[PDB]
Amino acid sequence: REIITLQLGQCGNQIGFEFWKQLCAEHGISPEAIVEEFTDRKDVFFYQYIPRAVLLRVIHSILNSPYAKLYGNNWASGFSQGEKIHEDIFDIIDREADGSDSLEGFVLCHSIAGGTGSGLGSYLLERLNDRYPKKLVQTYSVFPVQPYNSLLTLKRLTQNADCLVVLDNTALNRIATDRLHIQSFSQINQLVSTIMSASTTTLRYPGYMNNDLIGLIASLIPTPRLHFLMTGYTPLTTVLDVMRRLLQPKNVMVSNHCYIAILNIIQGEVDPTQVHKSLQRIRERKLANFIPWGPASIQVALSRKSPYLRVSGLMMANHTSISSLFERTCRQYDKLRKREDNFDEMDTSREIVQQLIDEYHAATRPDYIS
Amino acid sequence: REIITLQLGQCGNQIGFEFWKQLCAEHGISPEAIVEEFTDRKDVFFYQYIPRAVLLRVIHSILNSPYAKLYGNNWASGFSQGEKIHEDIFDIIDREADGSDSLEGFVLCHSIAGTGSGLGSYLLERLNDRYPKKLVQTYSVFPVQPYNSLLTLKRLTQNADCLVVLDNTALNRIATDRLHIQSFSQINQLVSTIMSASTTTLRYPGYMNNDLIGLIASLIPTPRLHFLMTGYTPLTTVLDVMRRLLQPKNVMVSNHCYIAILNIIQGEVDPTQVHKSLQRIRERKLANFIPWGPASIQVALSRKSPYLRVSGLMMANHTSISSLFERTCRQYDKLRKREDNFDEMDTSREIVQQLIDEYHAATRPDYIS
Ligand SMILES: Nc1nc2c(ncn2[C@@H]2O[C@H](COP(=O)(O)OP(=O)(O)O)[C@@H](O)[C@H]2O)c(=O)[nH]1
Ligand SMILES: Nc1nc2c(ncn2[C@@H]2O[C@H](COP(=O)(O)OP(=O)(O)O)[C@@H](O)[C@H]2O)c(=O)[nH]1
């Protein structure tokens, strides 16, 4: 099962580039797309090496980079341009689709901060559900007239994208000043590319459990509505050190409340005899709170680092606190609704997200059923 | 068994002149008709070396080309003048026939869109009179134009024992999509790639398909459904090539099902994963065939010329070729309501309707009777 990526706007093409650098570094792949001398299945992302990239100004500098051999501002205008090149761009997708053995998903790297890609992102997801109804789509959207373009794409992402990994630049810059002391764009993305790289540690390296993209998502997302995730990455030393440093709100990449499911990926060679002990100490101290209705647990799996390149770890969670972020956005909309052909699509968009904000607040009650 | 080819009209000359150039280089033959020193069977098309061609103001363009030592617009004008030189051009074909050991076919290259239309209609009629046992394959090219086009189809549906369609419209797309031309001097380069790779099994002898009648009788089941379309992917295993040939993006054509498929693999691919891919194509069901008769897919390998990497060509007998006719049939009636007997056009009109009905009847589970 092969995976293919799409990068839109200025943001998606930037972080996706460094995502291609860091991933190409994990394997023994020279910048010139040639294997050097110097186990790891490199066929899911690379096709004989050629990466399955689809890039939609900065592209000129991208080819000017040493990795050349590796291949308006409104929302409606971003949606219009996507319609003007409907068939022209789509041929690239189809020829890459069936030319591949068995497509599994569609990784989408894009921003919703008022860019032409933000609309461009809204269009592709509509058609991706039109043509291929049996193909999962994952999107690593990133959060910041900015209220407008933000709340609109949320209307499409809640019914087309079967998964989503949110990344807000606000909580990122807090990490930038504190533990890197920058006071730039190419500076914060250094850590962002790290999150995505380790996010697919269980895919590029074979393991027992979770050997496919449906193996990770099916456990966390309980319903096609509550389909929002957050990430964590602690190394910036035993197992009880990792999981305890992950649950802190100082590390989460997000600006009652409880968890639904957690996933912790350990990449080190740590002694696996103590992984159950760390699970006991986290329970007894009661450092995290779960749902009361159904039995919700925390899962951990192991894998191995790139031998070419120390204990790392990733935390993936579905927290109902993500509802607060939306409330920050939609509140700005009502304020911009009273201050400034039909303006009816903006109505149903505001309408459908307010159903989602109702769906989260209802999950925290012991009687969420019915 | 030798195959004497014919070239009519500006189209037939240009494709044939560039067909020979593709063949002369694929063998160790200098344009001076002299073998270069630098196994491949070359007697079918060449006579010990001279090509067996009978051409018919572009001729001067060939006589000035470095290959000089190798040899109106009405359909009625083509059929009329062809009758005035009945004895002239048949003197050449006859003297070229008996000089050959045992004649096998007449590969005729002409475009149905000026004089090549009316003259070719005359030849395909006259050949069946004198030569009743000679196959007549034609590499016809699809584009008053609706008139001259369909009139040739009257003859091409009862005389030509085979026909390979190559429409300029679908070619122009591939010229624009993957070549970005915007020219005749470029699209013919693709045509010459299709014509040369079509007879790769005759010039390179293998297990089977050592004669033209071996490639014909396999695909064409009945004397009427004798229209074939082509597919050429290289513009890597056998599964990579087989999957690309069945995509509608590669076919040179602008319910529906196949009748017979022949795959030509000109690579050095080991002959062990040939059955595995065919096994896989059946599983994923990338193509469907006729329900009435047993239809199977055939694959053939060959060897690339060392004097000149995996390629692939597919000979297809698809029912969707009936669509190209309807476009001609449609525009005819429009010109029939817009303006010594004018009966030949109506008689030709009837027989084309019999053909299209036969195609749409071929996709029925009761095509028999
Ligand atoms: N997280 C992150 N966001 C970025 C980066 N570069 C640009 N952005 C976001 O992209 C937005 C600008 O979009 P822009 O490039 O003008 O859209 P385009 O011109 O249509 O591609 C800003 O609001 C930024 O928040 C980056 O390196 N990291
Ligand atoms: N594919 C292809 N078709 C051609 C080329 N040259 C001419 N044709 C076709 O031939 C037709 C014109 O035929 P024409 O030369 O007038 O015939 P003539 O009256 O006997 O000279 C046009 O409709 C074209 O479609 C060529 O180089 N390639």
Side-chain angles (χ1 to χ4, degrees), chain A residues 1-182 184-308 310-340 342-370, chain B residues 1-181 183-307 309-339 341-369:
Chain A
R1 298 163 186 171
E2 319 181 27
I3 192 57
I4 181 170
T5 177
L6 322 167
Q7 313 182 18
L8 320 184
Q10 165 174 357
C11 187
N13 305 8
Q14 287 195 9
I15 64 162
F17 166 73
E18 296 272 11
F19 172 48
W20 279 124
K21 198 273 166 173
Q22 183 47 247
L23 196 146
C24 186
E26 272 204 31
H27 303 334
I29 317 301
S30 54
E32 53 188 359
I34 292 157
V35 52
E36 308 200 35
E37 42 269 16
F38 272 123
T39 301
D40 48 326
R41 159 205 209 182
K42 66 184 76 64
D43 206 275
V44 72
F45 268 104
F46 291 114
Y47 176 68
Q48 304 159 13
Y49 284 108
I50 287 308
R52 311 176 164 81
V54 168
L55 300 176
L56 300 199
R57 169 63 192 88
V58 181
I59 297 94
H60 279 53
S61 51
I62 291 179
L63 307 189
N64 291 17
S65 88
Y67 298 97
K69 320 197 195 51
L70 209 66
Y71 301 98
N73 196 50
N74 200 300
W75 186 85
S77 45
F79 189 63
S80 88
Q81 301 176 22
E83 194 67 52
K84 272 159 52 63
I85 54 177
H86 155 58
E87 204 67 19
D88 170 45
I89 295 300
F90 276 174
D91 264 20
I92 280 298
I93 308 176
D94 309 290
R95 69 163 294 269
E96 207 67 43
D98 262 8
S100 316
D101 312 307
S102 66
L103 265 182
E104 181 50 49
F106 282 90
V107 171
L108 170 58
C109 275
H110 83 85
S111 161
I112 70 178
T116 65
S118 80
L120 270 180
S122 193
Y123 176 70
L124 288 172
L125 289 173
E126 275 177 357
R127 294 282 95 83
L128 277 195
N129 267 3
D130 284 319
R131 320 191 74 190
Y132 312 87
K134 309 300 191 294
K135 299 303 174 171
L136 173 56
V137 67
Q138 193 182 50
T139 177
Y140 290 70
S141 158
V142 288
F143 287 3
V145 308
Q146 313 88 343
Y148 285 82
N149 307 33
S150 44
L151 77 94
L152 266 63
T153 73
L154 289 173
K155 174 247 187 167
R156 270 77 182 188
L157 287 156
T158 177
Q159 56 191 355
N160 294 25
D162 209 276
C163 170
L164 174 53
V165 169
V166 178
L167 283 88
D168 43 354
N169 279 322
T170 76
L172 284 179
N173 300 155
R174 276 192 187 181
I175 304 190
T177 317
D178 189 77
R179 299 167 194 185
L180 306 95
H181 300 285
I182 71 167
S184 159
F185 284 155
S186 165
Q187 196 62 39
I188 51 174
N189 308 317
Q190 304 269 344
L191 171 148
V192 182
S193 164
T194 317
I195 296 170
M196 273 160 301
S197 88
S199 88
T200 76
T201 302
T202 195
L203 260 184
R204 291 178 286 103
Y205 290 76
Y208 173 40
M209 310 182 312
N210 313 116
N211 276 270
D212 38 357
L213 203 72
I214 204 75
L216 281 73
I217 301 313
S219 159
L220 287 64
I221 294 174
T223 185
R225 314 299 308 180
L226 287 64
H227 54 257
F228 279 66
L229 264 52
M230 55 188 54
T231 74
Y233 187 81
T234 182
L236 293 175
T237 302
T238 57
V239 289
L240 68 88
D241 306 277
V242 173
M243 290 174 187
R244 203 154 79 262
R245 289 168 212 176
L246 281 170
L247 309 183
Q248 312 199 32
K250 70 190 191 187
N251 286 340
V252 61
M253 269 65 70
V254 192
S255 160
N256 203 28
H257 276 312
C258 79
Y259 287 170
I260 303 173
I262 322 178
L263 257 190
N264 290 168
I265 300 305
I266 319 295
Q267 287 197 198
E269 67 278 346
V270 307
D271 205 331
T273 185
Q274 48 173 348
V275 68
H276 80 284
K277 184 185 309 306
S278 161
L279 275 188
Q280 193 175 3
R281 180 176 287 171
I282 284 298
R283 169 202 200 174
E284 266 290 355
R285 289 206 187 113
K286 293 188 286 184
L287 207 156
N289 52 5
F290 284 60
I291 62 158
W293 46 282
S297 159
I298 177 166
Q299 285 278 15
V300 65
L302 295 87
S303 159
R304 314 178 295 271
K305 255 181 188 171
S306 158
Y308 310 111
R310 278 298 288 164
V311 172
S312 159
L314 199 151
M315 178 280 315
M316 190 173 287
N318 176 13
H319 195 183
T320 79
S321 54
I322 208 72
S323 90
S324 72
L325 201 42
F326 286 162
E327 293 285 82
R328 277 162 180 165
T329 56
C330 50
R331 185 196 301 152
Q332 296 191 40
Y333 170 53
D334 298 309
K335 301 307 296 283
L336 275 293
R337 196 76 179 181
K338 201 217 274 170
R339 188 178 182 271
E340 321 311 314
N342 287 71
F343 277 180
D344 300 343
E345 163 72 10
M346 197 161 299
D347 183 19
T348 184
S349 159
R350 160 66 176 163
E351 160 66 23
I352 184 59
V353 287
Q354 206 72 15
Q355 309 183 191
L356 178 64
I357 199 68
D358 184 290
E359 281 143 16
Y360 280 161
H361 274 79
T364 78
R365 272 69 175 264
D367 42 357
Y368 167 71
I369 196 68
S370 47
Chain B
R1 301 186 191 176
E2 314 180 6
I3 290 173
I4 172 173
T5 189
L6 313 178
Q7 306 190 14
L8 311 182
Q10 172 178 355
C11 197
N13 299 12
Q14 286 183 11
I15 53 188
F17 174 85
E18 290 200 310
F19 164 67
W20 285 122
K21 197 181 315 306
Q22 178 51 238
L23 217 48
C24 273
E26 191 175 2
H27 296 341
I29 315 186
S30 90
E32 265 277 350
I34 296 311
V35 52
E36 262 183 49
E37 78 302 338
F38 267 125
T39 314
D40 51 331
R41 166 201 215 180
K42 48 181 69 68
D43 64 350
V44 193
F45 298 89
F46 296 116
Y47 158 68
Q48 281 200 339
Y49 286 90
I50 293 92
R52 304 183 186 84
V54 193
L55 321 178
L56 270 168
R57 298 315 89 73
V58 179
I59 302 296
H60 273 59
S61 63
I62 294 183
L63 292 191
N64 313 138
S65 59
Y67 290 75
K69 273 182 91 72
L70 206 59
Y71 301 99
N73 214 334
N74 186 325
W75 179 95
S77 177
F79 194 83
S80 168
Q81 296 185 30
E83 190 73 74
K84 281 164 48 61
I85 57 171
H86 161 66
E87 59 83 12
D88 166 55
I89 68 155
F90 277 165
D91 182 1
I92 307 306
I93 302 177
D94 281 348
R95 81 180 273 260
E96 203 74 36
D98 46 0
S100 299
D101 195 11
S102 88
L103 211 42
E104 165 66 20
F106 282 80
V107 165
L108 164 60
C109 315
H110 71 78
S111 158
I112 64 152
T115 83
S117 299
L119 191 46
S121 299
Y122 183 80
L123 279 193
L124 294 151
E125 182 89 17
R126 285 275 96 95
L127 291 195
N128 196 1
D129 315 329
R130 312 185 68 183
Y131 302 95
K133 326 268 288 186
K134 312 304 179 185
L135 306 182
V136 190
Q137 187 181 67
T138 59
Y139 286 87
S140 282
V141 165
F142 280 5
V144 196
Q145 297 76 10
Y147 287 97
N148 295 10
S149 46
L150 66 90
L151 288 180
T152 63
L153 282 183
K154 184 237 180 182
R155 275 79 178 180
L156 286 170
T157 55
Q158 44 195 353
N159 294 23
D161 293 69
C162 192
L163 208 168
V164 178
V165 288
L166 296 93
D167 70 307
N168 287 325
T169 62
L171 285 165
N172 263 5
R173 285 173 182 168
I174 315 299
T176 299
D177 310 328
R178 287 141 198 170
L179 319 173
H180 325 273
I181 72 166
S183 44
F184 284 167
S185 69
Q186 169 53 42
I187 52 181
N188 286 346
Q189 203 283 329
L190 271 296
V191 175
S192 200
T193 318
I194 299 180
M195 297 192 56
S196 90
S198 192
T199 82
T200 176
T201 180
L202 295 183
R203 310 172 279 114
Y204 294 84
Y207 290 81
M208 279 174 286
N209 301 129
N210 309 305
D211 44 356
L212 189 63
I213 204 167
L215 297 200
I216 297 313
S218 177
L219 314 183
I220 298 170
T222 84
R224 308 297 291 192
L225 297 96
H226 63 283
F227 283 66
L228 312 176
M229 66 187 56
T230 44
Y232 194 73
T233 196
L235 297 177
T236 318
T237 81
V238 306
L239 192 43
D240 304 89
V241 193
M242 283 183 173
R243 186 140 78 258
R244 297 166 186 175
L245 307 190
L246 311 180
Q247 285 192 31
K249 258 172 184 54
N250 294 327
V251 297
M252 276 55 68
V253 182
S254 67
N255 206 14
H256 283 283
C257 72
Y258 287 159
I259 294 174
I261 297 312
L262 182 64
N263 281 134
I264 293 175
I265 299 302
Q266 311 192 221
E268 77 283 40
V269 50
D270 171 7
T272 190
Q273 50 186 339
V274 185
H275 90 284
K276 185 166 307 307
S277 276
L278 283 189
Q279 176 263 1
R280 186 144 315 158
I281 295 299
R282 179 185 178 177
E283 304 318 309
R284 285 201 191 98
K285 175 55 51 173
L286 292 92
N288 45 358
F289 311 91
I290 46 164
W292 43 282
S296 157
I297 178 168
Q298 305 289 350
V299 61
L301 293 87
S302 159
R303 318 191 302 260
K304 259 199 166 186
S305 191
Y307 317 123
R309 269 307 307 172
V310 55
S311 159
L313 191 144
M314 168 213 57
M315 290 315 268
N317 187 18
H318 196 192
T319 303
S320 285
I321 194 50
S322 199
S323 158
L324 270 295
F325 300 149
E326 200 276 337
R327 282 147 192 170
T328 58
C329 314
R330 165 192 310 165
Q331 306 178 61
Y332 164 66
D333 299 314
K334 177 254 183 182
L335 264 298
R336 199 49 176 159
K337 306 296 293 306
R338 192 179 181 271
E339 319 303 315
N341 196 9
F342 300 158
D343 189 282
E344 40 265 49
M345 312 184 188
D346 310 315
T347 317
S348 157
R349 176 65 185 177
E350 162 64 30
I351 196 58
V352 179
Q353 204 55 41
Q354 299 190 220
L355 171 68
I356 289 188
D357 171 275
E358 283 329 288
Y359 284 167
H360 288 76
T363 174
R364 262 60 171 268
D366 194 341
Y367 167 70
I368 300 167
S369 62

